[PDB]
Amino acid sequence: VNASNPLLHPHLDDPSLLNNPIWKLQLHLAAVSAQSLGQPNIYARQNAMKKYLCTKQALMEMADTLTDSKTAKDDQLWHALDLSNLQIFNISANIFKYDFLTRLYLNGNSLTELPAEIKNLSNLRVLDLSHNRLTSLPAELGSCFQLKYFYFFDNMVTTLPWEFGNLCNLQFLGVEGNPLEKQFLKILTEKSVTGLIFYLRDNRPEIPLP
Amino acid sequence: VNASNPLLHPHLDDPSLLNNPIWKLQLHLAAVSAQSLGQPNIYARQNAMKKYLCTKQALMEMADTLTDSKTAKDDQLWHALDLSNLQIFNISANIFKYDFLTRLYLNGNSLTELPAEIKNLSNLRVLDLSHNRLTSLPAELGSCFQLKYFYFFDNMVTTLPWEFGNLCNLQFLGVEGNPLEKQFLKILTEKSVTGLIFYLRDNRPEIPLPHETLCQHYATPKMYRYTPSWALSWDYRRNKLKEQILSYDSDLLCLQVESKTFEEYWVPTGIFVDGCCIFFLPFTNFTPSFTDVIEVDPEYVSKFIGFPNDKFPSDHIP
Amino acid sequence: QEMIPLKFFAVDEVSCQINQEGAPKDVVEKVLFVLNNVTLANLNNKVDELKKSLTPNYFSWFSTYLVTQRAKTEPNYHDLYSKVIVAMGSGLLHQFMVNVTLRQLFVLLSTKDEQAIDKKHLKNLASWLGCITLALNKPIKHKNIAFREMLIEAYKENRLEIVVPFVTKILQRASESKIFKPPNPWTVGILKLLIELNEKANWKLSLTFEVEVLLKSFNLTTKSLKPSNFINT
Amino acid sequence: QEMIPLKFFAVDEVSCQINQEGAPKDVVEKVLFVLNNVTLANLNNKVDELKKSLTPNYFSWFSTYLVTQRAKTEPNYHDLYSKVIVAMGSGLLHQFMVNVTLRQLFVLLSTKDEQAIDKKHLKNLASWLGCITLALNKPIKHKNIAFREMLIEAYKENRLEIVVPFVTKILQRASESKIFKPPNPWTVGILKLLIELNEKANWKLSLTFEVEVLLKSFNLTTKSLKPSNFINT
Amino acid sequence: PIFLPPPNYLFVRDVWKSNLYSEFAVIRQLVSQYNHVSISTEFVGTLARPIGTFRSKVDYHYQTMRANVDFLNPIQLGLSLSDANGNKPDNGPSTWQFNFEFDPKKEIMSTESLELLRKSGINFEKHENLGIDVFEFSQLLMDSGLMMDDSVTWITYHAAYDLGFLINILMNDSMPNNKEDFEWWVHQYMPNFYDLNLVYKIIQEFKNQYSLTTLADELGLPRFSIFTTTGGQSLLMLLSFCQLSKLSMHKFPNGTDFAKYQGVIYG
Amino acid sequence: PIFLPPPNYLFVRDVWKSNLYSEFAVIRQLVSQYNHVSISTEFVGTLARPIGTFRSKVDYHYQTMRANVDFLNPIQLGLSLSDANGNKPDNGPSTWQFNFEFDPKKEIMSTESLELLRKSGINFEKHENLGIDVFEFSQLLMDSGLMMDDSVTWITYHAAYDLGFLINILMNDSMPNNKEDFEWWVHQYMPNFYDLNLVYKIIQEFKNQYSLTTLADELGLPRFSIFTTTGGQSLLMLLSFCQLSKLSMHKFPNGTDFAKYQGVIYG
Numbered sequence A: 001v002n003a004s005n006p007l008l009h010p011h012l013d014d015p016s017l018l019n020n021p022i023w024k025l026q027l028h029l030a031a032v033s034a035q036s037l038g039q040p041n042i043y044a045r046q047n048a049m050k051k052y053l054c055t056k057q058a059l060m061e062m063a064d065t066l067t068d069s070k071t072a073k074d075d076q077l078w079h080a081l082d083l084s085n086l087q088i089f090n091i092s093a094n095i096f097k098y099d100f101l102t103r104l105y106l107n108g109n110s111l112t113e114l115p116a117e118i119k120n121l122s123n124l125r126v127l128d129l130s131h132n133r134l135t136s137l138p139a140e141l142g143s144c145f146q147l148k149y150f151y152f153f154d155n156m157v158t159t160l161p162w163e164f165g166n167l168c169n170l171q172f173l174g175v176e177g178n179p180l181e182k183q184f185l186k187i188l189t190e191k192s193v194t195g196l197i198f199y200l201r202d203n204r205p206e207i208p209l210p
Numbered sequence B: 001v002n003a004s005n006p007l008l009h010p011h012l013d014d015p016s017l018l019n020n021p022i023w024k025l026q027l028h029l030a031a032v033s034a035q036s037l038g039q040p041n042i043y044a045r046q047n048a049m050k051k052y053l054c055t056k057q058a059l060m061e062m063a064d065t066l067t068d069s070k071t072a073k074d075d076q077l078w079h080a081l082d083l084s085n086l087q088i089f090n091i092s093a094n095i096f097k098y099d100f101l102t103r104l105y106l107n108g109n110s111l112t113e114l115p116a117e118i119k120n121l122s123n124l125r126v127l128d129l130s131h132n133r134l135t136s137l138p139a140e141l142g143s144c145f146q147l148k149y150f151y152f153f154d155n156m157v158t159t160l161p162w163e164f165g166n167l168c169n170l171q172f173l174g175v176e177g178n179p180l181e182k183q184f185l186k187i188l189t190e191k192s193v194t195g196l197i198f199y200l201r202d203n204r205p206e207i208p209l210p211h212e213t214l215c216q217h218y219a220t221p222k223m224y225r226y227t228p229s230w231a232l233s234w235d236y237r238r239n240k241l242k243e244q245i246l247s248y249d250s251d252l253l254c255l256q257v258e259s260k261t262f263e264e265y266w267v268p269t270g271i272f273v274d275g276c277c278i279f280f281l282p283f284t285n286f287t288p289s290f291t292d293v294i295e296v297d298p299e300y301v302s303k304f305i306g307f308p309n310d311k312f313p314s315d316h317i318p
Numbered sequence C, D: 001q002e003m004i005p006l007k008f009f010a011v012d013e014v015s016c017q018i019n020q021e022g023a024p025k026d027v028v029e030k031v032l033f034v035l036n037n038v039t040l041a042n043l044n045n046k047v048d049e050l051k052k053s054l055t056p057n058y059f060s061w062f063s064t065y066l067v068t069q070r071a072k073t074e075p076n077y078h079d080l081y082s083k084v085i086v087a088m089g090s091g092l093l094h095q096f097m098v099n100v101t102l103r104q105l106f107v108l109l110s111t112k113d114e115q116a117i118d119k120k121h122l123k124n125l126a127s128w129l130g131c132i133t134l135a136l137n138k139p140i141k142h143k144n145i146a147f148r149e150m151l152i153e154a155y156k157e158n159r160l161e162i163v164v165p166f167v168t169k170i171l172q173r174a175s176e177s178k179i180f181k182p183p184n185p186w187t188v189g190i191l192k193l194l195i196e197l198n199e200k201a202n203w204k205l206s207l208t209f210e211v212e213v214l215l216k217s218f219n220l221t222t223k224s225l226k227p228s229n230f231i232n233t
Numbered sequence E, F: 001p002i003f004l005p006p007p008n009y010l011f012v013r014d015v016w017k018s019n020l021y022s023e024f025a026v027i028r029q030l031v032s033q034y035n036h037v038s039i040s041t042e043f044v045g046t047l048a049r050p051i052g053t054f055r056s057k058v059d060y061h062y063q064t065m066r067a068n069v070d071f072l073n074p075i076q077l078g079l080s081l082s083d084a085n086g087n088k089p090d091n092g093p094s095t096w097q098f099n100f101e102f103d104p105k106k107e108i109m110s111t112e113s114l115e116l117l118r119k120s121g122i123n124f125e126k127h128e129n130l131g132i133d134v135f136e137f138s139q140l141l142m143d144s145g146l147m148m149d150d151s152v153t154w155i156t157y158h159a160a161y162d163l164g165f166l167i168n169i170l171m172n173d174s175m176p177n178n179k180e181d182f183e184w185w186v187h188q189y190m191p192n193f194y195d196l197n198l199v200y201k202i203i204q205e206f207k208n209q210y211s212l213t214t215l216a217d218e219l220g221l222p223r224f225s226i227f228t229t230t231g232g233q234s235l236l237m238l239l240s241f242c243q244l245s246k247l248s249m250h251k252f253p254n255g256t257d258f259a260k261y262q263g264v265i266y267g
Helices: A021-036 A042-052 A057-070 A093-097 A116-121 A183-203 B021-035 B042-052 B057-070 B093-097 B116-121 B183-202 B234-247 B259-266 C025-036 C043-053 C056-071 C075-088 C091-110 C119-132 C147-157 C160-171 C185-200 C205-217 D025-036 D043-053 D056-071 D075-088 D091-110 D119-132 D147-157 D160-171 D185-200 D205-217 E020-033 E057-071 E111-120 E124-129 E134-143 E160-171 E179-189 E196-204 E212-219 E230-247 F020-030 F057-071 F111-120 F124-129 F134-143 F160-171 F179-189 F196-204 F212-219 F230-247
Strands: A080-082 A126-128 A149-151 A172-174 B080-082 B126-128 B149-151 B253-255 B277-279 E012-015 E036-042 E049-051 E076-082 E095-099 E153-156 E193-195 F012-015 F036-042 F049-051 F076-082 F095-099 F153-156 F193-195
Touching (some): A042 A080, A042 E049, A093 A116, A172 A183, B021 B057, B021 B183, B042 B080, C025 C056, C056 C075, C075 C091, C091 C119, C091 C160, C119 C160, C147 C160, C160 C185, C160 C205, C185 C205, D025 D056, D043 D075, D056 D075, D075 D119, D091 D119, D119 D160, D147 D160, D147 D185, D160 D205, E020 E076, E076 E230, E153 E230, E160 E179, E196 E212, E196 E230, E212 E230, F012 F020, F020 F076, F020 F095, F020 F134, F036 F160, F076 F230, F111 F124, F134 F160, F153 F230, F160 F179, F212 F230
Parallel strands (some): A149 A172, B126 B149, E012 E095, E153 E193, F153 F193
Antiparallel strands (some): B253 B277, E036 E076, E076 E095, F076 F095
16 A cells, blocks of 8 residues: 555656656656565676676666667676665675675665665665665765665655765666655656756755864 | 300319419410400511510410420511401401411401411411400311411310311410310310320211222321321221222232232232232322322312321322 | 494594605615514614614604505514514604504404405404504503404404404414413403303304414413303393 | 792693604704804705704704793894794694793793793793794694783782783784784784773883783774773772 | 484583683683584575676685675584594583574564574574674684694585684684685684585595485484584584594595595585 | 682592493593593501511511502592693593492401491492492403503502502402512503602602691692592592692702602602
């Protein structure tokens, strides 16, 4: 009964946001994410196949952002950590000690918090929080600037913490859907992602020195 | 009440054996004995002092007998064992495995018995059972024939085993005093010791059998003293050799023999002062000197220290 | 060949930090020269040289050679070789010798197919073990070989035909030992079990002959000692 | 001097059957020649020769010399001598070295009168122990020295002034060890107890300086780790 | 062929915070004489997967293991000592099961595998309150005399993870980038060890799954409930390895020593 | 100075016919690691005295002892093992008291010392029925690995008789004529041993009775009831010897080793 909830999905209430290319995207990718469920470490498996021959909604986010904008015109080595879909209430502080990670899928768990340490993940590029119990997101997720794709689909999330759009390079912030405050929603539609990020960059409240 | 008891020392009755040098020596030596009580290992102490320069009972014996004589005219080593006056109600047979022992003092303990293995002690010369609890003495103490002095005083001993006087060499035997049957006491008073020893040797009771060569000059009593004097005499041994030879019907008799008794006795045929004649195992030879060969029931040969004896008129056999 | 576990026989490691090597051509040479030219008389000297050639790091090798190459097949020379070992005066070298002997012995005794074991080598090796242990007034530790137990086990496994010669060939060396010859309560306990088997076993007559030869070496007969109670039947 | 029992320090025997002798004039000669003429560069060869002169039967001696004659008084050369030992490649020789060092150390640490113990030799010897053990990625067994325990014991005995340098001189070698340097939970547990003492002890300032130098060698300060709970007060 | 180890051999001792130090004393004592030690561990195995490049299937196996040892904590660890012939002290426990402090609420777990593990016989309450602190543990294990000694022989079955956790506990640091360093550390910390799973593989492969229980069954051992516990597990792999090494005199059918595969991991 | 051995150290195990073999197994196991063994015995000491010659007071002492060992049987014998530092296994009994088969009625005794011995705590019924058979005993002790090994170190206090009985039991023959042979046997059967009574004498004689309980008191040990038993006796003399040898590094005040008086009897 959370799929039919207009707070979570605003095109239930619109109705037609569905002819907004922006929400068309959102509901799309969000559908792909929703599809991912039930298999542990989906991404890793999908990369098994992809390497061999396989959705990989990071890759579908890529396809869709390209088609969206085309029609609108020794060792170091492995970089991505797949913790997806092991219904897991908690996250090891050690994962943050891996600073070389550019990817990190946390999606499909019970995580109710995201550790502040996320900030030492600064080389981060994709991040996936979807289908968890997050009720809010770390500022100092803001320190993560190199982020391109960021997904928390399905959480209960009211707000973005200013900070990001401290993150400039973000191409897609998937929000559909958690109970967004509608001010960010209204910006996300009409300004898209980069627009939302810019409202945040620009209007963050002050802060003094001592 | 025992020190004054008549039934113990019968000389409170006489009243005087105190004249009789026999029960005189019984009294002097019995008192030298009952003196030594109370101190652990006397003989070893005494011998401490002796070796240095409290006399001895063995030595008091030797003297008193010597006066009765005056007036009648790397190692091997230590031989004596002292268990005296540490009041012992038992003995491990182990002491008897010590056969070099010629002395063995057991006096002043609680011994209520003497283990028969004593007989394994054969070189024994002194023996002291004085002041123990002994009810009676073992047989087979008689296999101890080399005994010179042997004391058991204060004990309750009624009868002597026979067996001894199987013991020839015994000079002193202290009996004073134990409620003896008084007849042994009788032979002892005035026949002395060997009076009694011989008494025993010569009347033992009959000693039977289950079942199945000494020329007389060589048969001298001095040599075989365990054989009751009559059995030793040639009158007996002729008859025996006869019944022996006749029962055994052997077609060739090699006789191992005085010449005279061959041409008188044996002739009623065959052929030949001494000699050897002819007509037509555990031991061959049984004596305390050497029991060897150069089989008869061995439970029989026990309870004898040698031959010839009541039924076998030579130290040899067929 | 299929192996079976052995309950009462075991070998331990030798405890040393000294790293064991094989030997180079020249060491092997000097050593086999010494071993081949040795007589009872020259022993002390020959060995004095051997000591210069053969260093502790080589012990583990020497042993393995001498046992498997010589001792195993050449009984006559046991005494001699024994006297060589003793002459070296190394407890470690001795440890090694016994260790090897024990292992080879283990192999034979744990072979599952009786007919597959060469009994000439079994006998030679048991005699060798005895020769460097009991005959030297040194014990065989219970943890290495537990005889009475091993015998009873063999009786319940119908393995008596491999074990009995093995035991009797080892024990037959106790007669050179002031310490282990009867009435050494150990030696004797064993003897009494062997006598008890030589009645109650109904085993083949070769075995009886063996128990008899062993008892012979002590100047005793199967009549000498009361058999024990260990074989219930 | 009167000795006291030591709860947490103990030396075991070396386990070998090899009979240890002193050395005759010529062995001592060859050996001291090698030891005196050795430089870091010639080491491998010089030692190659030493190996020909010094046989295992002599180890027990070499050790007792090298520790008491050299290592005890000549800290500079610890590294060098360490490298010599390592070069020999004998576990037995090493066993012996540690054994000696441990004994001498035992004597010092059990001396009842504090002023009676030469702390230059205590320090030199602790540094030597560390140098042939921790710094080599080999452990000091708990049965030999139990540090945390020994420290607490020292605090209850007012012996902290002999023990603390002893510990810190040994540990200070852990910084040459990929294995024993922090955060090796062992090294660190000790550090934390030392830090806890450096507050709660109210001990003399020489000690504090020692805890601080040790912590220095790891690039830490008394601020680096939370002290432990072991000192109740 | 029936293999029935003496009854005392089968006794496994639970170690908690409460009894840690005493048991470690006992261990410290026995290690000299009983120089063969076997190790087993128990954790969620809820593996995170690494993605990206690596190198052959081994760099991938190692990478996965690394990531997991880093993200996970072992619930239990079994240890078993015996002599080289597989004898154990006729007196006292020769096999320990150490229960670490583990809070389901604070650690990675899935009610799935939480319940699977409660069925396994883990009592998470006890582990929560009475559980051993792994710092203390690592510390006792350091100077105990099991580690860093050619004298001791370590025994493991399919060791990649078990050795991973062990080495991780001893290092008190993040596992290394690469298999190579991890191996430097393994060989430093445990200079003599065997993977029973690999020796058995090799053996079964003359005459040509490899599950320890198979090796156990072929060796003659009954299946005693005790063998399913983590401690029990170390026990079983030790009994098995000793028996097997006795029978073959640690020689393969072809006459080369087990010692060839000393130091060799996986299986 | 207070010396308080760990509690398990103070445990003495009664051995009877019933449990002889098991205990001997344990012993057989421990001997490798715990190589110091101490011996005590208990008998009537009812001594018979030999008379005749001999040679110096030693040939007399020897002769008396010989005679007595021959004529007497030991009622009890204590044994105790520990490592050279005096450590014992934290698990299981490290001290045994063997009770031999002894029939008052069949053996040398005086109701005097019978009653003195009952007060001592000897139960003659148990010894009569359940008593160890000394043939069995001697046999187990032979191959156990305590005898005839330089590795093991024997500890005794005022040893003449104790060593006499022991050597007598091992020989299964009558004790020799002379001290000299007896000594050849002692040194063969026990190549490394000390008389604590003599080491202590010598020590007390710098700074210049010697009863073990004095050594014990000076050493710091409380007087525990257990120490009065025969087994307890072996225990005490072992604890004492080990402590004393630790303190002095087995060196006399003058710097010569205890090893000088190794092999040396009496006191």
